[PDB]
Ligand binder design. Structure first.
Ligand code: HIS
Ligand code: HIS
Ligand code: NI
Length: 302
C-alpha cells in the first residue's frame, strides 16, 4: 500500500502504513496537531522548547533528541539505528539531504517559505500519516483571513527580525519574512538579504531605523540584549521600547498564523479594537490541537 505525494525534490512514493517517523529541522508541532506522538522516534532537540510540544508529548523520554543544525551532514548512522519508515526534514542543505537519502530510508523533504506553503506541506504529511487534516487546516486559513481583514488599509510598520545574533535578519524566500509580512510588517531585510537569513552591517540597521524589532524564539538574545546594545541606541524601536521576542511557536507548523497574529497585535494594536483576542486564541487551540478548556488556559494570551 502506498501514496504518492510531492516534496522539495519532486514526486515521492510513501509506503503505508507509517509506524516510525523522525522530524528533522522543522514541523515539530505536527505530531501535536495530529495526535501522532506515538509514531515519533526522533525529533530535533529545539522541539522540546515548544510549549505545545511540552504540553502534548506525554513521554518525551522515549524520543531521541536529534541535531537542530541544517547545514552539517545528517547523522545517517543514528538515522539507521532508529529505523524510521519516514524522515520529515527541512532542506537547509540540498546536497547533504540528497546524500542522506542514499541510505535506504524514505525522506519527505520541505523548505517552507510561506504560511501557505506550510499548510500545503502539513497536508502532504497528513497523507503519509493517513489523517484527515481538513478542519484544522481550515482553522489556520480562517485565522489568516481574519488577520488580513483587520490589517486591510493599515500602513505597514517598518521592522525586521533578529536571529541568533543581532545583525542576522531575514529576506527573500524566508518563512520568517512571510510571517512578518502577514503580521503587517514592512521587513527591510528584503532589501538586503536575497535568500533565507543572512548578516547585515549594524550601520545599515541604524540607517533603516526600524519602528519595531522582533527576535526569533530560538535566539539567545533577549529583548534587553537588544535594547541595551549601545550600537542600537538611536533606533526608533529601541527608543520606543518596541522590541519583542516571538512566542515559543515553531514557525514551520500549525501555529504559524498565531505568530503573525502576535506580530500584528504588537505592531497595530488599534487594528484589533473590538476583537476578543482570547476567544480567537481559545478556539484556535481547541480546533487545531483538540485541547479542552483547562488545557487551553496556559496558552491564552496574558
Ligand atoms: N527551522 C526552524 C527550527 C530551527 C531550530 N534551529 C534552527 N532551526 C527555524 O529556523 O525556526
Ligand atoms: N531555518 C533556517 C533558515 C532558513 C530559511 N531558508 C533556508 N534556511 C535556519 O534555522 O537558519
Ligand atoms: Ni531553522
Amino acid at each position: 500500500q502506498e501514496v504518492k505525494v510531492k516534496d522539495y525534490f519532486g514526486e515521492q512514493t510513501i509506503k503505508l502504513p507509517v509506524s516510525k517517523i523522525i522530524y528533522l529541522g522543522s514541523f515539530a508541532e505536527v505530531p501535536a496537531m495530529f495526535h501522532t506522538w506515538d509514531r515519533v522516534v526522533g525529533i530535533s532537540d529545539y522541539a522540546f522548547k515548544s510549549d505545545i510540544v511540552k504540553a502534548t508529548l506525554k513521554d518525551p523520554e522515549r524520543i531521541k533528541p536529534m541535531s537542530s543544525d541544517h547545514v552539517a551532514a545528517l547523522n545517517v548512522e543514528l538515522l539507521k539505528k532508529l529505523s524510521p519508515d519516514l524522515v520529515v526534514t527541512f532542506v537547509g542543505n540540498p546536497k547533504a539531504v540528497e546524500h542522506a537519502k542514499k541510505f535506504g530510508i524514505s525522506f519527505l523533504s520541505f523548505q517552507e517559505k510561506t504560511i501557505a506553503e506550510v499548510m500545503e506541506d502539513i497536508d502532504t504529511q497528513a497523507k503519509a500519516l493517513e489523517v484527515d487534516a481538513s478542519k484544522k487546516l481550515a482553522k489556520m486559513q480562517e485565522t489568516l483571513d481574519f488577520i488580513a481583514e483587520r490589517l486591510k488599509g493599515v500602513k505597514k510598520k517598518k521592522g525586521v527580525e533578529l536571529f541568533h545574533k543581532a545583525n542576522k535578519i531575514s529576506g527573500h524566500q524566508a518563512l520568517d519574512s512571510d510571517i512578518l509580512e502577514k503580521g503587517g510588517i514592512d521587513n527591510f531585510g528584503l532589501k538586503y538579504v536575497k535568500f533565507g537569513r543572512a548578516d547585515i552591517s549594524v550601520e545599515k540597521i541604524v540607517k533603516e531605523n526600524p519602528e519595531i524589532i522582533f527576535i526569533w524564539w530560538i535566539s539567545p538574545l533577549s529583548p534587553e540584549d537588544v535594547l541595551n546594545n549601545p550600537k542600537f541606541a538611536t533606533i526608533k524601536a529601541i527608543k520606543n521600547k518596541q522590541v519583542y521576542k516571538l512566542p515559543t511557536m515553531d514557525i514551520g507548523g500549525p501555529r504559524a498564523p498565531l505568530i503573525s497574529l502576535f506580530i500584528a497585535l504588537k505592531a497595530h494594536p488599534e487594528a484589533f479594537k473590538g476583537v476578543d483576542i482570547n476567544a480567537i486564541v481559545k478556539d484556535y487551540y481547541k480546533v487545531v490541537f483538540d485541547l479542552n478548556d483547562a488545557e487551553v488556559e496556559p496558552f491564552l494570551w496574558k
